[PDB]
């Protein structure tokens, strides 16, 4: 067991106060956890709009890396 739990550091609520608290906190939860449906779409990415010198090293370290990083 290595999840970080909610801790009541001070105070001792009754079961009904604990239930009210946890229901409120869960309603205040951040919604869906993360946007797992996010999809890669590199069309018109800003790095493709830059002018690069034909001998520019940023062709390797900026342009190519941005296209290839996954």
């Amino acid at each position: 067991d290595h999840e970080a739990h909610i801790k009541v550091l001070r105070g001792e609520p009754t079961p009904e106060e604990m239930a009210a608290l946890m229901a409120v906190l869960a309603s205040a939860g951040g919604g869906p956890a993360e946007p797992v449906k996010k999809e890669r779409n590199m069309w018109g990415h800003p790095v493709d709009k830059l002018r690069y010198s034909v001998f520019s090293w940023q062709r390797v370290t900026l342009l190519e890396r941005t296209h290839m990083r996954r």
Binding site: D1, E3, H5, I6, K7, V8, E12, P13, M18, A19, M22, A23, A26
Partner: peptide, 16 residues
């Protein structure tokens, strides 16, 4: 959903 809550060092289980 089961949430473990710690209350003064007590384990407590809350089902939601």
């Amino acid at each position: 959903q089961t949430v473990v809550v710690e209350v003064g060092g007590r384990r407590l289980e809350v089902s939601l």
